[PDB]
């Protein structure tokens, strides 16, 4: 899932920046501090969208920086258990297929791709009885079955009804019409 | 932790997130992961931001929770089976058909 969060914080502005635009300076500091961070509860911080409020600066002894209370908005990516997702296969190995979900990828272990005997062809995952094939570039619909975010592993499966490579789903619809 | 406290949140569609990331890329170079996110978002956004947000609003007007409305807007289900995929371990909505009509209505 993707979310926009409203966050209250206190931003430290060094004296070397006192001549620059306050909002731009605060935004830059927030970007350097939080973008790229991965939090188990919050998710992956993708962007500091905007700074919505900046209070008066406070100065504490022994410190030359100005501490400003602020409220900023941020876009985050957060995987959720049992979530239905759609993504692109970016790597296929003998033990599974990696699927891009945004800034993070999920892994469909080789035994969770399809209900069939599969084999990895060094020269895509192929089903022996169905002929179904999964290779880099394919779009898939899957479900998250395991999450381990470390400030990482996201496990995916398509071995449930209504899941699979998009083309397989479209074919099923055609037959059922 | 991220900030002193999270005041509130809003689930957003992939379509809207894609435009938000597009704007971020206009103010500075993206990291590798931010770049992957932009690529993913642009490829899986099935509507522009305006339409996606309009769809979510319509679905919410029917009493559909925010998270689910967003997921529906992201997936754009075409039949009952697609809805069954979304409503995992959940009973299908009594308004299942109306949802499909609206989705098949982003038009």
From Swiss-Prot, chain A:
Its main location: cytoplasm. InterPro entries: NA-bd_OB-fold, RNA_pol_Rpb7-like_N_sf, RNAP_E/RPC8, RNApol_Rpo7, Rpb7-like, Rpb7-like_N, S1_domain. It is found in: Cytoplasm. GO terms for biological process: DNA-templated transcription initiation. GO terms for molecular function: DNA binding; DNA-directed RNA polymerase activity. Residues 82-159 form the S1 motif domain. Part of the RNA polymerase complex. Forms a stalk with Rpo4 that extends from the main structure. This is DNA-directed RNA polymerase subunit Rpo7. It comes from Methanocaldococcus jannaschii (strain ATCC 43067 / DSM 2661 / JAL-1 / JCM 10045 / NBRC 100440).
Swiss-Prot record, chain B:
Pfam families: RNA_pol_Rpb4. DNA-dependent RNA polymerase (RNAP) catalyzes the transcription of DNA into RNA using the four ribonucleoside triphosphates as substrates. This subunit is less well bound than the others. GO terms for biological process: DNA-templated transcription initiation. Its EC number is 2.7.7.6. This is DNA-directed RNA polymerase subunit Rpo4. Belongs to the eukaryotic RPB4 RNA polymerase subunit family. GO terms for molecular function: DNA-directed RNA polymerase activity; nucleotide binding. The gene is rpo4. It catalyses: RNA(n) + a ribonucleoside 5'-triphosphate = RNA(n+1) + diphosphate. PANTHER family: DNA-DIRECTED RNA POLYMERASE SUBUNIT RPO4 (PTHR39646:SF1), RNA POLYMERASE RPB4 (PTHR39646). It is found in: Cytoplasm. GO terms for cellular component: cytoplasm; DNA-directed RNA polymerase complex. Keywords: Cytoplasm, DNA-directed RNA polymerase, Nucleotidyltransferase, Transcription, Transferase. Part of the RNA polymerase complex. Forms a stalk with Rpo7 that extends from the main structure.
């Amino acid at each position: 899932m993707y979310k926009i969060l409203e966050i209250a914080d206190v931003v430290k502005v060094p004296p070397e920046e006192f001549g620059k635009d306050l909002k731009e300076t605060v935004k830059k500091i927030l970007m350097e501090k939080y973008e790229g961070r991965l939090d188990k509860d919050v998710g992956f911080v993708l962007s500091i969208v905007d700074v919505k409020d900046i209070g008066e600066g406070k100065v504490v002894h022994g410190d030359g920086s100005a501490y400003h209370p602020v409220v900023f908005e941020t876009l985050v990516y957060i995987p959720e258990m049992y979530e239905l997702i759609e993504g692109e296969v970016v790597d296929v190995v003998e033990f599974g297929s990696f699927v891009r979900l945004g800034p993070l990828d999920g892994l469909i272990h080789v035994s969770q791709i399809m209900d069939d005997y599969v084999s990895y062809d060094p020269k895509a995952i192929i089903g022996k009885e169905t002929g179904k094939v999964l290779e880099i570039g394919d779009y898939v619909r899957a479900r998250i079955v395991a999450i381990s975010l470390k400030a990482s592993k996201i496990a995916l499966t398509m071995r449930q009804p209504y899941l699979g490579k998009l083309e397989w789903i479209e074919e099923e619809k055609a037959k059922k019409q | 932790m991220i900030g002193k406290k999270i005041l509130g949140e809003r689930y957003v569609t992939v379509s809207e997130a894609a435009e938000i990331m597009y704007n971020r890329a206009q103010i500075g170079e993206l990291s590798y992961e931010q770049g992957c996110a932009l690529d993913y978002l642009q490829k899986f956004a099935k509507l522009d931001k305006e339409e996606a947000k309009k769809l979510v609003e319509e679905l919410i007007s029917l009493g559909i929770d925010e998270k689910t409305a967003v997921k529906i807007a992201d997936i754009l289900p075409e039949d009952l089976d697609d809805l069954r995929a979304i409503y995992y371990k959940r009973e299908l909505p009594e308004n299942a058909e109306e949802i499909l009509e609206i989705v098949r209505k982003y038009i």
